Amino acid sequence: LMQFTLPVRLCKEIELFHFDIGPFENMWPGIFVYMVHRSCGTSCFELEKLCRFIMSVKKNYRRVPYHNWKHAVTVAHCMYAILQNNHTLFTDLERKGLLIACLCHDLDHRGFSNSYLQKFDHPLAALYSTSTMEQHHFSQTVSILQLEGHNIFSTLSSSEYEQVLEIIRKAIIATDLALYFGNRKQLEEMYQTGSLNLNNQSHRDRVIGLMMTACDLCSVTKLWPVTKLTANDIYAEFWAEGDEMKKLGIQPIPMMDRDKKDEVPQGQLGFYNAVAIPCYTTLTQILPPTEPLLKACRDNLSQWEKVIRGEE
Ligand SMILES: CN1NCC(C(=O)N2CCC2)=C1C(=O)NCCc1nc(-c2ccccc2)nn1C
Ligand SMILES: [Mg+2]
Numbered sequence: 195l196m197q198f199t200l201p202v203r204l205c206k207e208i209e210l211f212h213f214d215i216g217p218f219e220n221m222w223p224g225i226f227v228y229m230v231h232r233s234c235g236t237s238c239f240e241l242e243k244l245c246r247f248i249m250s251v252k253k254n255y256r257r258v259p260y261h262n263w264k265h266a267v268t269v270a271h272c273m274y275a276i277l278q279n280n281h282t283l284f285t286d287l288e289r290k291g292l293l294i295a296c297l298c299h300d301l302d303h304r305g306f307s308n309s310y311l312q313k314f315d316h317p318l319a320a321l322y323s324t325s326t327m328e329q330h331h332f333s334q335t336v337s338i339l340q341l342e343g344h345n346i347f348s349t350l351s352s353s354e355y356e357q358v359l360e361i362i363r364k365a366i367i368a369t370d371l372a373l374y375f376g377n378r379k380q381l382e383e384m385y386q387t388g389s390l391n392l393n394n395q396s397h398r399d400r401v402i403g404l405m406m407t408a409c410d411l412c413s414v415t416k417l418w419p420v421t422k423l424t425a426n427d428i429y430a431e432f433w434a435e436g437d438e439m440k441k442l443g444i445q446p447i448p449m450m451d452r453d454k455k456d457e458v459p460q461g462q463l464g465f466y467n468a469v470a471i472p473c474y475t476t477l478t479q480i481l482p483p484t485e486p487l488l489k490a491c492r493d494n495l496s497q498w499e500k501v502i503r504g505e506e
């Protein structure tokens with residue numbers, strides 16, 4: 195009979211797509227449990243097992259500027275908002291799996307791209323030739339699920355358990371942005387030719403994949419000061435990777451070169467036009483109640499255009 199309850203401002207604003215989880219790290223576990231209880235049920239998980247899983251998940255995120263515990267909870271919250279605005283579209287197992295997938299999707303991230311691991315010749319690049327970090331994040335999720343007292347799915351049948359772990363594997367792999375372009379083109383063609391079918395499992399997979407991209411990129415759907423300050427954390431990682439590329443004797447791409455800071459605003463416009471806007475446009479076509487994400491992304495594109503015009 196033990197609910198989590200949040201203060202009034204958080205209780206109202208957590209329901210909105212643009213919610214920022216705030217700088218009080220100690221409230222993030224409670225925020226997550228709150229979201230599971232409302233999006234899944236107070237019966238989905240044994241509270242003591244869920245609490246122990248969340249805290250081991252936190253321990254296995256590193257102290258990097260962007261790909262950290264705050265990012266994990268932020269991406270889970272965007273998924274909560276999508277699930278709560280599309281009540282009847284998702285199965286019981288999907289509601290269970292997807293918040294967990296989001297919390298776990300960047301486990302043990304080091305702040306480097308798949309490219310850098312391949313050029314450094316990191317051991318993970320030999321074990322997983324494509325989607326290198328994302329296969330590692332899924333591997334870290336299964337490890338934590340198998341620690342004593344951490345199996346939050348213990349009440350599922352053997353076949354349901356296999357199905358949830360397959361939802362999580364696919365959802366985590368889909369956060370490889372290299373895979374996003376092709377997934378979105380197929381979804382665009384399917385929706386427009388009217389072949390899109392939510393009883394087709396391979397179609398559900400693609401739609402859940404696009405949801406993962408949308409949640410993963412959700413800093414672009416926040417209030418402008420959140421968007422702008424999150425971008426600083428993103429580039430702090432990229433520029434450290436650029437420095438490490440120069441240490442291997444390789445000129446990084448400009449996105450990762452701190453000498454080319456001046457070009458960030460134009461790089462943001464390219465990213466909004468080539469990745470974010472098309473992501474939230476297709477998502478809105480498939481799931482109309484996600485429209486607020488697209489509207490917020492377009493507002494932030496317009497703020498980056500003001501930056502370029504020297505209006506800020
Ligand atoms: C907001 N965001 N969410 C996620 C995300 C992203 O890529 N993730 C991969 C791991 C996180 C971004 C983001 O900002 N990406 C950079 C966009 C960009 N900057 C530049 C650039 C900058 C300066 C000089 C020259 C080029 N080019 N481009 C294309
Ligand atoms: Mg990732």
Ligand SMILES: [Zn+2]
Binds near residue numbers: 265269299300410
């Ligand atoms: Zn991520």
